[PDB]
């Protein structure tokens, strides 16, 4: 193998740090042997060099035999040189998504051969790669070597190799603008819209150009055929898809089977529209053993099946036409479950996906819908360099009402309503000012931090009154109780006055779902009322019947 | 020759991620960096440079040309000894006093001065590819980069020369520089001011340096506002003591004891209760109190500045700069095709420049928006050469109205 004529990268050790001096464990003759064979070869090839005992650095070597075979393997444990090596720039910070790929006439995959070894190593660093093949026991000073090229398993090899291959290609890319070259790890992905004529030829100019550089790729015939089985995906000429998802029929489900499942399912979601994983995931909560058997909940079984259905056939995605636009459609699946599909030409999807997240402790569909829009927007920038025009199941007038009166800033890029149910709405609104001839409930809540004993109640202005005793509460929970009380006994239109900024805040937000069951009943209530006015006042300030509910709920509690 | 820059002790280079960017902002950046490369201001770099600072593209203040903006916030924090407790630029108390203050971009000055060979690497940035198809293009500065607060600290000496003439001949013009910008204050007629700014750019132009009108002395109060009404209701009074009771403990010597007494027992909210006069002596005593400043509130040069913004509706946003909560150094509002983010972005810059004009430093913003939404969008509306520090928050229901 060729060892690249190219320039080298300056490599430094971390500051105030010195090369490794780890002692070589003593080996069996078979391994000392093995290693000797292996090493002389690497030296024959230029890959390593023989040093003396003047160079004090040491990194432990080890030979491992075979699974089936009788071949030996050199293993160098660069854990210390690694712990002393500087940090490098992050290799590649994200991986191409198939759907971001522009359709090309022909694409050829060139896998560099023996990459790491095909590239020099900064001469002045070499000394740190020192290793020793021990002699038979202690007797006899070992054989010392040091790398000339990038050693496998060392911190910078991935980085440097990457750089080198960027520098090597620079030229070619100049005098070859229309050819696309994806660089990934030690692979080269090449495509052009030439007729197989100049393509099959341009491929060779590259290989030759790569060869002037020490880089040996395979020739044709030994060049892979499409569909490329790359990275979890199946890359065909005019479509792409995930690699065969095989959903296991089983008698009992262990934590681990369920996990592997959710995994396969989630990966399937990139192109298999409408995959759900909520019920399945739910089972995972609390986690017993890895080997523990979970019993499929009924919803769980129903999910699993809706899934098998979607997968019971095959879906593939198209590639990217930078001229056409991007459309993104989102649909409400279930409980904080969203599904989206991106396409340029109606119904020929580039990719799909889902959004579930619980952003907050209580939330609603308008707040979730925009969270998904954000998640999709970014995702588009990443893949395509631009954002999609959106078609959301929310009415333009609902959006605007919500957007307008909300405390926090929000902004959805271009969009259009699309009557594809369930539709997004607000299940209740609070009055802006007091209902006339409606009862004023002055609610309250207390809870003794010592006994965690609580008292929830109200005192209305039609002289009505109530108080309840709660047992393992907090003030937040008593104050939410008081309001539920007032909701419970008040009918079609109320006026509620609290001193809980917390309950105020919670409710003013129009939640429609909540992590609290208390917040959920209240929601259920507010949804029933015809008119609800809710206002706040400072507490422990002789205000209205505020003090009146105070003595009520404080009596015993505080 | 170059000046030696050294990272604050016990810390090292910025390893900040590059936010993803759109195709159009990417070409804009690719072109720009090629030219800067030819002109030798930034040179490509190798894997051996672990450092990284985000970079973006803006379309300045009402401009068609793309400007490349480098987010040096991390770096500025790590070199803070150098540009602050070393090569610091003293801030003119005078500036906030002038009838007129013009802001001029002076950022192209730096392109002359070279950056210490040993500091360069700290300046790495990346021009990211789309769909991670290729390695991002990595760069490092060879000269004073704009956005890095070390540049003015260094350049400070050469700006003194550039400006000594104009100064000798205009003893009552205040010249301040905060980062890439020059702030020029004068009490002259506007035509006169404009003339001197122009006379100023001539001087600047002989050294290579190639406005935007502020009116400090006209920046007034956002006095907490109590309504005036004929016929009150339990509500309004309830709301009255509410706001009133809150303005106290922040507004030294408020009073409610009267008002409270009108609210006794449990009556409907829809109930009209006339006002006693002593209670009226209360609104007034308070109302009057509100027009006048805080008292006891002084800027602490060693403490950070905070700015909170509340979305009020109809294109209106309120805000307050303070160092201790409810110890407001300054309050105000901002008012408006302008979505929430566009508007919030502009508020953020307005306040930031006032902040610079008055104290010479920027406030840490508490923005009422989703980190994500904001992150993806702001650069669309951003036009300053600096970027302030921000953190996201949820306005406390009561704060919005107590400030309405
Ligand atoms: N293995 C592999 C692999 C992994 C990646 Cl990310 C890219 C890749 O190449 C392309 C793939 C492209 O996709 C569209 C396309 N045109 N022609 C094709 N032929 C195939 N057999 C597969 C995909 C395409 C376009 C340009 C290119 Cl260069 C190959």
Curated annotation (Swiss-Prot), chain A:
Changing residue 191 to E: Confers resistance to efavirenz, nevirapine and quinoxaline. Changing residue 102 to E: Confers resistance to atevirdine, efavirenz, nevirapine and zidovudine. Changing residue 136 to M: Confers resistance to delavirdine, efavirenz and nevirapine. The record marks 402, 415 as: Essential for RT p66/p51 heterodimerization. Changing residue 189 to C: Confers resistance to nevirapine. Changing residue 78 to L: Confers multi-NRTI resistance. Residues 435-558 form the RNase H type-1 domain. Changing residue 136 to L: Confers resistance to delavirdine, efavirenz and nevirapine. Changing residue 66 to R: Confers resistance to abacavir, adefovir, didenosine, lamivudine, stavudine, tenofir and zidovuline. A motif (Tryptophan repeat motif) lies at residues 399-415. Changing residue 104 to N: Confers resistance to atevirdine, efavirenz, emivirine and nevirapine. Changing residue 70 to D: Confers resistance to lamivudine, stavudine and rarely to zalcitabine. Changing residue 191 to A: Confers resistance to efavirenz and nevirapine. Changing residue 75 to I: Confers resistance to HBY 097. Changing residue 211 to W: Confers resistance to zidovudine. Changing residue 189 to L: Confers resistance to efavirenz. Changing residue 90 to K: Confers resistance to pyrophosphate analog PFA. Changing residue 190 to I: Confers resistance to HBY 097. Mg(2+) 1 binds at residues 111, 186-187. Changing residue 70 to A: Confers resistance to lamivudine and stavudine. Changing residue 209 to Y: Confers resistance to lamivudine, pyrophosphate analog PFA and zidovudine. Changing residue 117 to Y: Confers multi-NRTI resistance. Heterodimer of p66 RT and p51 RT (RT p66/p51). Heterodimerization of RT is essential for DNA polymerase activity. The overall folding of the subdomains is similar in p66 RT and p51 RT but the spatial arrangements of the subdomains are dramatically different. RT is structured in five subdomains: finger, palm, thumb, connection and RNase H. Within the palm subdomain, the 'primer grip' region is thought to be involved in the positioning of the primer terminus for accommodating the incoming nucleotide. The RNase H domain stabilizes the association of RT with primer-template. The tryptophan repeat motif is involved in RT p66/p51 dimerization. This is Reverse transcriptase/ribonuclease H. It comes from Human immunodeficiency virus type 1 group M subtype B (isolate HXB2) (HIV-1).
């Amino acid at each position: 193998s060729p060892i690249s004529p190219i320039e080298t990268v300056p490599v430094k050790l971390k500051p105030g740090m010195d090369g490794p001096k780890v002692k070589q464990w003593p080996l069996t003759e078979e391994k000392i042997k093995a290693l000797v064979e292996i090493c002389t070869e690497m030296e024959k090839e230029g890959k390593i060099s023989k040093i003396g005992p003047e160079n004090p650095y040491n990194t432990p070597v080890f030979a491992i035999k075979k699974k089936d075979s009788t071949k030996w393997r050199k293993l160098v444990d660069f854990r210390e040189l690694n712990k002393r090596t500087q940090d490098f720039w992050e290799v590649q910070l994200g991986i191409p998504h198939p759907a971001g790929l522009k359709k090309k006439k022909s694409v050829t995959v060139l896998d560099v051969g023996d990459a790491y070894f095909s590239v020099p190593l900064d001469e002045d660093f070499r000394k740190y790669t020192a290793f020793t093949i021990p002699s038979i026991n202690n007797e006899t000073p070992g054989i010392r070597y040091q790398y000339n090229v990038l050693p496998q398993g060392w911190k910078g090899s991935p980085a440097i190799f990457q750089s080198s291959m960027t520098k090597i290609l620079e030229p070619f890319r100049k005098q070859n603008p229309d050819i696309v070259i994806c660089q990934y790890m030690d692979d080269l992905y090449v495509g052009s819209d030439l007729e197989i004529g100049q393509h099959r030829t341009k491929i060779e100019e590259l290989r030759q150009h790569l060869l002037r550089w020490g880089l040996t790729t395979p020739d044709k015939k030994h060049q892979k055929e499409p569909p490329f089985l790359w990275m979890g995906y199946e890359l065909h000429p005019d479509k792409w898809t995930v690699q065969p998802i095989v959903l296991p029929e089983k008698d009992s489900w262990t934590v681990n089977d369920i996990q592997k499942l959710v995994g396969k399912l989630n990966w399937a979601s990139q192109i298999y529209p409408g995959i759900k994983v909520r019920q399945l995931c739910k089972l995972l909560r609390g986690t017993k053993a890895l080997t523990e058997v979970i019993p499929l909940t009924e919803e769980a079984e129903l999910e699993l099946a809706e899934n098998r259905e979607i997968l019971k056939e095959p879906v593939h995605g198209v590639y990217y036409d930078p001229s056409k636009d991007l459309i993104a459609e989102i649909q409400k699946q279930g409980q904080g479950q969203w599904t989206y599909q991106i396409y340029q030409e109606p119904f020929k999807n580039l990719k799909t996906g889902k959004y579930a997240r619980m952003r907050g402790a209580h939330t609603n569909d308008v707040k979730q819908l925009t969270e998904a829009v954000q998640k999709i927007t970014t995702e588009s920038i990443v893949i395509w360099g631009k954002t999609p025009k959106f078609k959301l199941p929310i009415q333009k007038e609902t959006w605007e009402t919500w957007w307008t009166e909300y405390w926090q800033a929000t902004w959805i890029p271009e969009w259009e309503f699309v009557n594809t149910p369930p539709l997004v709405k607000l299940w209740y609104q609070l009055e802006k000012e007091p209902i006339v001839g409606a009862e004023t409930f002055y609610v309250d809540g207390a809870a003794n931090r010592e006994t965690k004993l609580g008292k929830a109640g109200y005192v209305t202005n039609r002289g009505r009154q109530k108080v309840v005793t709660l047992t393992d509460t907090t003030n937040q929970k008593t104050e939410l109780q008081a309001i539920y009380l007032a909701l419970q006994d008040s009918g079609l239109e109320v006026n509620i006055v609290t001193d809980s900024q917390y309950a105020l805040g919670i409710i003013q937000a129009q939640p429609d779902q909540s992590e609290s069951e208390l917040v959920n009943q209240i929601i259920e209530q507010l949804i029933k009322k015809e008119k609800v006015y809710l206002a706040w006042v400072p507490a422990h300030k002789g205000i209205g019947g505020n003090e009146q509910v105070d003595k009520l709920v404080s009596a015993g509690i505080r | 020759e170059t000046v030696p820059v050294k990272l604050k002790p016990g810390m090292d280079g910025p390893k900040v991620k590059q936010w993803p960017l759109t195709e159009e902002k990417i070409k804009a950046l690719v072109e720009i960096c090629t030219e800067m490369e030819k002109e030798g201001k930034i040179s490509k770099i190798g894997p051996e440079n672990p450092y990284n600072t985000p970079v973006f593209a803006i379309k300045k203040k009402d401009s068609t040309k793309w400007r490349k903006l480098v987010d040096f916030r991390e770096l500025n924090k790590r070199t803070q000894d150098f540009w602050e407790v070393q090569l610091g630029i003293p801030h003119p108390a005078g500036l906030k006093k002038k009838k007129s203050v013009t802001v001029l971009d002076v950022g192209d000055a730096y392109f002359s001065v070279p950056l210490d060979e040993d500091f360069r690497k700290y300046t790495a940035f990346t021009i990211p590819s789309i769909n991670n198809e290729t390695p991002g293009i990595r760069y490092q500065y060879n000269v004073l980069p704009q956005g890095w607060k070390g540049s003015p600290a260094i350049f400070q000496s050469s700006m003194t020369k550039i400006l000594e003439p104009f100064r000798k001949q205009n003893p009552d013009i205040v010249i301040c520089q905060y980062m890439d910008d020059l702030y020029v204050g004068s009490d002259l007629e506007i035509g006169q001011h404009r003339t001197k700014i122009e006379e100023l750019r001539q001087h600047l132009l002989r050294w290579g340096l190639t406005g935007y009108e502020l009116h400090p002395d006209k920046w007034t109060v956002q006095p907490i506002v109590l309504p005036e009404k004929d016929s009150w209701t339990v509500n309004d009074i309830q709301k009255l003591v509410g706001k009133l009771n809150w303005a106290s403990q922040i507004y030294p010597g408020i009073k409610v004891r009267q008002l409270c007494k009108l609210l006794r027992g449990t009556k409907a909210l829809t109930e009209v209760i006339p006002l006693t006069e002593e209670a009226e002596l209360e609104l007034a005593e308070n109302r009057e109190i509100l027009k006048e400043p805080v008292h006891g509130v002084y800027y602490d040069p060693s403490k950070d500045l905070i700015a909170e913004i509340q979305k009020q509706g109809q294109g209106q946003w309120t805000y307050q700069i303070y160092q201790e909560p409810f110890k407001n150094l300054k309050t105000g509002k901002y008012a408006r095709h302008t979505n929430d983010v566009k508007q919030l972005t502009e508020a953020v810059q307005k306040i930031t420049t006032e902040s610079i004009v008055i104290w010479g430093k920027t406030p840490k913003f508490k923005l009422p928006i989703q980190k994500e939404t904001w992150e993806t969008w702001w650069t669309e509306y951003w036009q300053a050469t600096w970027i302030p520090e921000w953190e996201f928050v949820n306005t406390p229901p009561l704060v919005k109205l107590w400030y309405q």
